[PDB]
Design a protein around this ligand. Structure first.
Ligand SMILES: [Au+]
Ligand SMILES: [Au+]
Ligand SMILES: [Au+]
Ligand SMILES: [Au+]
Ligand SMILES: [Au+]
Ligand SMILES: [Au+]
Ligand SMILES: [Au+]
Ligand SMILES: [Au+]
Ligand SMILES: [Au+]
Ligand SMILES: [Au+]
Ligand SMILES: [Au+]
Ligand SMILES: [Au+]
Ligand SMILES: [Au+]
Ligand SMILES: [Ca+2]
Ligand SMILES: [Mg+2]
Ligand SMILES: [Mg+2]
Lengths: 156, 152, 152
């Protein structure tokens, strides 16, 4: 039997960040040649990944932000991964972008890899928790993969 | 059997970086609702993770640093994962913050994922290897997960 | 019997970035104490990892760039993972360094972790897609690890 996993991403539909509003992740099919859903025993709900199987899971994400200091400066954001509800942020999952010294252009940020116990129905999402100016998100991607079955629970 | 793994983090207790001093990682329970230790056949020793089972592992870490160019400027830090001793740095595990490159404010960094053979008693730690100014670490997290039993 | 994996890296030989030129990754043994190739059912070809076994994989990379030397005023570099051909860039695999100051030392970037269905003969490489000024790459590492046998 296969590990549970999913990969949901945006590489085509820019979005403006909004405080505690999960980022839109409309695609699950990253292979440009053999284009198939990279999903097993998870569900992509358009703005995140829902867990169906209890277990220990690695979760992580990336964003691309277009920085131009327009219409206002500076343009800055802080993002986390959330469990179930947007304010329910997960430690270790911070990313941050600021236009103050980098200047202009697309900037890419990547979270670390968090290991966390998840249960059926758990919803993982990327949420902005602080914003200054208009944050133009040109790409985002959420990665969920099952490291192991529960290590203290028979079914959990 | 169950893959060996550990997640050791600090989200509660800011620390100043000191050269070749492992970062403090007091917590192992990241889920804010069902709070349980994310530890199987590893030990969280308080400033890193000790390997109890030989195998291939994926190792990675994160840091949050507060840059403000006070009391000295610029503020800069370079960090790497260490094996057993702080001088024994692991390739591909490097992170950096430089206030003259990225500007002041809170910055998050993340290492790549390192695939490495590890043996019982191996201690994985996050160490600063270069510090300019007083480097204020607001958060840190270390990730260790077995991907395979020893291939050879 | 064991998951397919490869770790190919450069900790030793600096290279200049060129547009759509895969980075050189000459080493497969990261453990400084017990130096063994971290390779199982993949091939390190010198500038990437070739897949031999169909499956779902996690792929990611890291680079270190030196802003020392490089007198050029603005320096910027954007990189992706490519599938088979350098122009065939994989979504979610972006990295970027953009500095308006030099002499600031080394800075590290890390991609996210992409989950992707790969087939035998597939070649994963790190490619520069945008370069402003001269980009001195002082280190690079590519991580390939199988997550699952094919699911459909
Ligand atoms: Au499983
Ligand atoms: Au987009
Ligand atoms: Au939906
Ligand atoms: Au559990
Ligand atoms: Au437990
Ligand atoms: Au195992
Ligand atoms: Au930077
Ligand atoms: Au902290
Ligand atoms: Au081995
Ligand atoms: Au190098
Ligand atoms: Au200048
Ligand atoms: Au500096
Ligand atoms: Au497939
Ligand atoms: Ca990363
Ligand atoms: Mg703008
Ligand atoms: Mg300060």
């Amino acid at each position: 039997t296969l590990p549970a996993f999913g990969f949901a991403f945006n590489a085509s539909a820019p979005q403006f960040a909004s405080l505690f509003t999960p980022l839109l992740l409309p695609s699950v099919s990253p292979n440009p040649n053999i284009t198939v859903p990279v999903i097993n025993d998870t569900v992509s709900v358009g703005d995140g990944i829902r867990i169906l199987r209890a277990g220990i899971y690695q979760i992580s994400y990336t964003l691309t932000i277009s920085l131009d200091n327009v219409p206002t400066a500076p343009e800055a954001g802080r993002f986390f991964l959330s469990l179930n509800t947007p304010a329910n942020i997960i430690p270790g999952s911070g990313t941050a972008v600021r236009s103050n010294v980098i200047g202009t252009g697309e900037v890419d940020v990547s979270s670390g890899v968090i290991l966390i116990n998840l249960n059926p129905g758990d919803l993982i999402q990327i949420v902005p928790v602080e914003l200054i100016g208009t944050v133009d998100i040109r790409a985002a991607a959420l990665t969920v993969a099952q490291i192991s079955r529960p290590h203290h629970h028979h079914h959990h």
